Amino acid sequence: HNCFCIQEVVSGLRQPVGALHSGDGSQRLFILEKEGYVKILTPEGEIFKEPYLDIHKLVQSGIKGGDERGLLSLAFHPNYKKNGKLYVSYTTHDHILRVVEYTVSRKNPHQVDLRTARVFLEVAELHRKHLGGQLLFGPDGFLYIILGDGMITLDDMEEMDGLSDFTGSVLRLDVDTDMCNVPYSIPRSNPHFNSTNQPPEVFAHGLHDPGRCAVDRHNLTILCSDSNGKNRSSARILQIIKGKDYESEPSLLEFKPFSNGPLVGGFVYRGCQSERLYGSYVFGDRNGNFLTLQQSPVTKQWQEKPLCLGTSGSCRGYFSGHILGFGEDELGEVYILSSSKTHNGKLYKIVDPKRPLMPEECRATVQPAQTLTSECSRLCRNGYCTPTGKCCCSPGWEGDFCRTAKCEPACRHGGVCVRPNKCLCKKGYLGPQCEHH
Numbered sequence: 541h542n543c544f545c546i547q548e549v550v551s552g553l554r555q556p557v558g559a560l561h562s563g564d565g566s567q568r569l570f571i572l573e574k575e576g577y578v579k580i581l582t583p584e585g586e587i588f589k590e591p592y593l594d595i596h597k598l599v600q601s602g603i604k605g606g607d608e609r610g611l612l613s614l615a616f617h618p619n620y621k622k623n624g625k626l627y628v629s630y631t632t633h634d635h636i637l638r639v640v641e642y643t644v645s646r647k648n649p650h651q652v653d654l655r656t657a658r659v660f661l662e663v664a665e666l667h668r669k670h671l672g673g674q675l676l677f678g679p680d681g682f683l684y685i686i687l688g689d690g691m692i693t694l695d696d697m698e699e700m701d702g703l704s705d706f707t708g709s710v711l712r713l714d715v716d717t718d719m720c721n722v723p724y725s726i727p728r729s730n731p732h733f734n735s736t737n738q739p740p741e742v743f744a745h746g747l748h749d750p751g752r753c754a755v756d757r758h759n760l761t762i763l764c765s766d767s768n769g770k771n772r773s774s775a776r777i778l779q780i781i782k783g784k785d786y787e788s789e790p791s792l793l794e795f796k797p798f799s800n801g802p803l804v805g806g807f808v809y810r811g812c813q814s815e816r817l818y819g820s821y822v823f824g825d826r827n828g829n830f831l832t833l834q835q836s837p838v839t840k841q842w843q844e845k846p847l848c849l850g851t852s853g854s855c856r857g858y859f860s861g862h863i864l865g866f867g868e869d870e871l872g873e874v875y876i877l878s879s880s881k882t883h884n885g886k887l888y889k890i891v892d893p894k895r896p897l898m899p900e901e902c903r904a905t906v907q908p909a910q911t912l913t914s915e916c917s918r919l920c921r922n923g924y925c926t927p928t929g930k931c932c933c934s935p936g937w938e939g940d941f942c943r944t945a946k947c948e949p950a951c952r953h954g955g956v957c958v959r960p961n962k963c964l965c966k967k968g969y970l971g972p973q974c975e976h977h
Contacts, residue, residue, distance in 0.1 A: 936960025
């Protein structure tokens, strides 16, 4: 038979939202928990006692199920290995969907220091469904953020005033700035770049209730399942070509290739363990029914095909509970994260039993995560530090890395400008500037 196979990796998680890797060589798998935690799974298979990220007090999460409100998504900078930069989305008139950047401990590669929270976006939301929140870097290194309805209606926007124009849209930002005013630059080739009509951040609109959108990096394609609420579920696809400058939005083309009902989301499998699954879009429903969306090269049309699970040895045709999201290895291998109704979150790995667990092609040396050595990370005294390496000085500091203090009128008589507007005077000189004797 041609079935796939699931294998329990980790258990005792608390409501897993999903998992991904950091692209830094350590085959570390970072697991997201809804309450506002990110935990680390070593390639050697240990869940580190200390959480990688613990923001559970900041995040307002669900008090039940169906309540969509926790930590939403995580994304590492394309150059995390050098600049150690994360990007995180989470909930906090009802609530605000925040998108924030964090930077790892300069002393611990396995922990983020929370003092580096640098808010990028704050999206007001009225309801607790159709939130979205998925974050991804396409090639060219732009931050794509995918936002659902928030169940905001047309009339709810003529009533409300101070309310985000982003909900229901794919947003695109250039995070790599040497500027120190705006936390992000609006990209190069965005539609509404200069803008007056429609907000510059919006790259496309039309999303309602999107699942985990499959992301094909090939020059970039994102394929979403969309529940559409009461209406039948569809699939929306967004395509991006070679550095093209847009002045009209790319169309987020809708088509309805699904039959079974709602889907958690999907992925484009590009791991090593499965030969046959290579390049396939795989979508999965809540109860672990799996699909493949294959596009005909000849007709360019789409076709859903089922995908069975089957037990062979301890690698089994079933998992416990229901699927909450999906996972991706550094090696590109693929996971499901499940939970069952307290503290029963599980990580399972999808396996092709026709192939070995460790084929020749799949061997890879793990390069263990390393403390930051980037110039801005070490020298940039205080004030923040942009993913490009620029050090942005907090009021009253100057210098490439802000190490010099600013004293408005200078310190006199050999006095030293220790802090902004603080003079350290030599014995015998009183006064804020050491002016008197």
